[model samples]
Target: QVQLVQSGGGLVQPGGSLRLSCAASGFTFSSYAMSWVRQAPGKGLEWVSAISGSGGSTYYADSVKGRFTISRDNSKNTLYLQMNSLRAEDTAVYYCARDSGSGRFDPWGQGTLVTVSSASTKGPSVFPLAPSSKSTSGGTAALGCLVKDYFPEPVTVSWNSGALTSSVHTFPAVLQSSGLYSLSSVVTVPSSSLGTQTYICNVNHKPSNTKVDKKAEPKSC
Candidate 1:
């Protein structure tokens, strides 16, 4: 499988710095150039930088001309984007795309959300992904939690105090028009428990250790 797997996003204090990685597979990594593109919460798409497959040539937009560098490790089949002196405006989801002249960016890495702030929020706002509270009467059921508009990453989601195990569908944070971040996480549980089961979502703000909790109930059919 040709995969452009990316590193998990991160939360960093203002003026701080961080590193992100993209590992390529299923194709000759060294034979295809890679570009790092990003999008602010809701703004249009922007290309930050690109590196030739041969790992010799490089290109970076002026927005990050002096502050961003894109490089590759052909031996490891990986590429990297490192930024310094971060700014609030730098908060966004970054994607890695492979260059195939005909396809432009035919294959792209799952974006990694990056939140840059000065310890922005006191805590995170965790909401049920959907409030319908649908039926979960048989087989397996899914409960969702949306961590809406929060600060730097430093957050964790748990179900029933610890539902970290069955979360098959997880959303890395996405930039919001409000300059905040949002995430939707889902957990699968046996449907038999729907009648009496109330799913819990917990968001632990790692910055100050503040805890926020919310829940959604599914009706039995």
Candidate 2:
């Protein structure tokens, strides 16, 4: 079957470092452009960048420049992308996609994901809501997650609640670097779950593994 799978999800701290991967199967990597996308916890989707192996050309969205890179190993028929500098906002679902050049994704890999937590064995640290932040009984709340590090491969981000749709609230911005760039996905949750809702953040760090949020937390939040 045609497939793309990513590396394991990472549990890291903001300002720490990490990496992820995306490996492909059932298609010739040299013949197509592989792209990466990002989605924050309980939020919308954002396109990070794309790479074309046929022409050795790389294109990044205007947003993520200094903090992200996309490369490939034609010998292995695998495209790699990476990001650096851990941040809470970098947490999200990352995926690898076959770029058809229409700025849309088709036949996407099962996404590898990550969630940014604090440094603790029990789990990455969880931040409490800001005292000034408002919460409603049945309204929306903003939940942030980030990758904080980069793996050399293509990846994407998304949100889901059993059913996948492009309706999660999102905001896009760019992080500048001396010679690189990064993209940030700020997302919002529509409503709260009974207790702790699992907001998944994944990446395509490897071909056989896709990381999820529950895996990041060793203890109940």
TM-score each candidate.
0.60, 0.52
What is the lDDT, from 0 to 100, of the residue 172 in candidate 1? Answer: 75
Clashes of each: 3, 47
| Per-residue lDDT over 77-160 for candidate 2, one digit per residue giving the tens place of the 0 to 100 score | 666666666676777788889875675676787776765655322112222222122445477555544433333222344554
Clashes in model 1: which pairs? 11-153, 41-175, 159-163
* TM-score of candidate 2 versus the correct structure, residues matched by position: 0.52
Error of 1 at 133 (Å): 28
User: What is the C-alpha lDDT profile of model 1 across 119-194, one tens digit per residue?
Assistant: 4664667766543345445776777877776665657877778645654566777757675768887887776776
Displacement of residue 139 (Cα, Å) in model 2 is 26
The candidate that achieves the highest TM-score relative to the unseen native structure: 1
Candidate 2 clash figure, as a count: 47
lDDT of 1 at 14: 76
